[PDB]
Design a protein around this ligand. Structure first.
Ligand SMILES: CC(=O)N[C@H]1CNC[C@@H](O)[C@@H](O)[C@@H]1O
Ligand SMILES: [Ca+2]
Length: 642
């Protein structure tokens, strides 16, 4: 059961899904839930075993009102030989009773059980709020079904790069095509019991005048016409007047008073502050307390923790709550990769204190621009925020992988386990990676480097890893159970497979039959390096972190260091002069050259390019008018026309 229920009593009897059943509650219970139930009961006829579905207050469930948790979205579920009860505290609770029911049903059989359940955190879900290609319409439809199945009740739509979400075209209604698609998203979210929260991000060019105020209002009104019933205003990552607290609070309160309190059915009204984490707060400034004191009590204030990227702690949530005068609505910046875009972040969700549910009013994950890939952290975040006290890091991760790709779980597992760390970055945030084999890697390399014998067991572990990596890469590429997931990760799967092959060859170079066999392996390895460079230069070419990195934390560094090392030993033994560099680089220059898009740079006297190119400019720190260029004699960046 994911998420795990608050309370669970299991019997060790199993009853069959009644061939003949009698349904009590069908026309009075939440239709979404009745719909799931009926699908599960296809080819089953309606005397028979009584099944009771309904919300508190419904005739159908009166007998059980005591049993139904007195919690929003709570429910009571019961299966025995004589009957089934599915009873929500409210309509969404009945739907969630059904989501739990569906997981219990295995082979037309059910365990005898009694469950009392409800969420420990009121708002749980996802904020699509990253920089990068926003999620496709189809990705989104898929996400909303996934959210319902995992009792996530919130989808906050706010992709930084959607021009009708941010400046300047926030002022503009969506075009007809986009609008109809959003209308469809709201309907699907409704059906899966998710609040679609439409966010707008206007602060960068907002004028604090009636005109802009009205435009914002009319935009919200248009969204309402499309079915939206929840709203947010994001003030993150902007500069200027669009960051004045009082003005923000005033705008928020006005939206509240003239809009959220004027429609009959508006649910969530949420604002993300400009100072959105501790380390970006002006120490002793009045930004957060102004918001805390001026914002109407019913307005949620988002927060990403002590740092831009970070895990939520007891001391952290307390620090913020004292200033905003209410429980923070958490915006957790994981697995979002928009600042390390050459990495996938597919590891477990961990790091967030499990005892602070009461201290947060919401918990949403900012995911990767890779939607299907993000379902691993998303399912885990769903599990954590519904029941943080039973949150199990690795078990949920494995459960997510097996839900996403039952046909190749172990392979996805192998792949995700070695694609979890972010590498070095401006936000300082890291994840463990490849911990299973890290000790063996570390012993092997320390010994080898120092001419001290390595343990044969460690050598074999590595070897075994490279082999499993190749099997999972090839099996992943050809998987058709979730094509969109495979499309998203393919570049990295290729890169991952070449990494595994590079490791095998380098290991063979360590064993090293003879002089000629060594050179064969050494040459194979140069070729692989060049192939990795090629993928890194042709796949995923975005402006910020172009390319494709994989197994960066433990595995690549082990292979590279082992290569440099065995080559040095070969050069010594045979008085040779093999090049021991580990990153193929087609240009020539003691710091490593790098190639990013059409820049050729020295890592922070004479460079020689592998060819003549039109020069664009040189930016040095202590234009070329298209002049031909191959050599450059004297930050250190050459841009050329490529
Ligand atoms: C509140 C917030 O995190 N805003 C920005 C910038 N900080 C983190 C980045 O990952 C972005 O995705 C995010 O949209
Ligand atoms: Ca009802």
């Amino acid at each position: 059961l994911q998420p795990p229920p608050q309370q669970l009593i299991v019997q060790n009897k199993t009853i069959d899904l009644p061939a003949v059943y009698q349904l009590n509650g069908g026309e009075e219970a939440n239709p979404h839930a009745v719909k799931v139930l009926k699908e599960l009961l296809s080819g089953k006829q309606s005397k028979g075993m009584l099944i009771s579905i309904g919300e508190k207050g419904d005739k159908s469930v009166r007998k059980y009102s005591r049993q139904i948790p007195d919690h929003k979205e709570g429910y009571y579920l019961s299966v025995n030989e004589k009957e089934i009860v599915l009873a929500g505290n409210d309509e969404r609770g009945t739907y969630y009773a059904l989501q739990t029911f569906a997981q219990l049903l295995k082979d037309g059989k059910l365990p005898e059980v009694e469950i009392k359940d409800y969420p420990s955190v009121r708002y749980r879900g996802v904020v699509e709020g990253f920089y990068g290609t926003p999620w496709s319409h189809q990705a989104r439809l898929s996400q909303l079904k996934f959210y319902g199945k995992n009792k996530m009740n919130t989808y906050i739509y706010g992709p930084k790069d959607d021009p009708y979400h941010s400046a300047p075209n926030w002022r503009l209604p969506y075009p007809d095509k986009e609008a109809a698609q959003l209308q469809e998203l709201v309907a699907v979210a409704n059906e899966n019991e998710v609040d679609f929260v439409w966010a707008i991000h206007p602060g960068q060019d907002i004028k604090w005048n009636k005109e802009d105020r009205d435009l914002l209002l009319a935009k919200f009104e248009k969204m309402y016409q499309l079915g939206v019933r929840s709203f947010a205003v994001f003030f993150d990552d902007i500069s200027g007047e669009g960051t004045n607290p009082q003005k923000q609070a005033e705008l928020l309160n006005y939206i509240d008073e003239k809009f959220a309190q004027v429609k009959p059915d508006i649910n969530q009204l949420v604002m993300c502050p400009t100072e959105y984490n501790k380390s970006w707060s002006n120490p002793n400034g009045n930004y957060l307390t102004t918001l805390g004191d001026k914002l109407n009590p019913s307005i949620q204030i988002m927060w990403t923790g002590d740092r831009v990227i970070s895990d939520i702690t007891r001391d952290g949530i307390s620090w913020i709550n004292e200033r905003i005068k209410r429980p923070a609505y958490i915006w957790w910046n994981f697995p979002v990769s928009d600042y390390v875009r050459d990495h996938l972040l597919l590891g477990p969700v961990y790091g967030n204190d499990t005892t602070i549910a009461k201290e947060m009013s919401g918990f949403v994950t900012n995911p990767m621009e890779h939607a299907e890939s993000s379902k691993i952290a998303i399912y885990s975040v769903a599990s954590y925020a519904w029941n943080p006290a039973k949150y199990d890091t690795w078990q949920t991760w494995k459960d997510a992988i097996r839900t996403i790709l039952p046909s190749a779980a172990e392979e996805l597992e192998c792949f995700a386990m070695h694609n979890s760390d972010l590498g070095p970055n401006g936000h300082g945030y890291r994840r463990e990676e490849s911990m299973d084999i890290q000790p063996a890697a570390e012993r092997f390399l320390k010994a080898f480097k120092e001419g001290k014998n390595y343990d044969k067991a460690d050598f074999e572990t590595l070897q075994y890893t490279f082999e499993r990596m190749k099997e999972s890469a090839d099996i992943l590429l050809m998987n058709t159970e979730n094509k969109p997931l495979i499309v998203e990760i393919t570049p990295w799967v290729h890169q991952f497979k070449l990494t595994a092959e590079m490791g095998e060859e380098v290991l063979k170079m360590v064993e090293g039959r003879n002089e000629s066999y060594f050179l064969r392996k050494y040459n194979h390895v140069k070729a692989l390096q060049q192939q990795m460079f090629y993928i890194d230069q042709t796949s995923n070419q975005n402006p910020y972190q172009p390319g494709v990195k994989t197994a960066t934390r433990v595995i690549k560094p082990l292979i590279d260091r082992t290569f440099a090392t065995v080559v040095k030993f070969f050069n010594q033994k045979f008085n040779a002069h093999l090049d021991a560099t580990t990153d193929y680089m087609p240009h020539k220059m003691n710091l490593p050259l790098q190639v990013k898009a059409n820049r050729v740079l020295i890592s922070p006297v004479e460079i020689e390019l592998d060819a003549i190119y039109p020069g664009e400019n040189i930016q040095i720190n202590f234009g070329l008018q298209k002049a031909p260029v191959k050599f450059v004699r004297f930050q250190f960046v050459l841009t050329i026309e490529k």
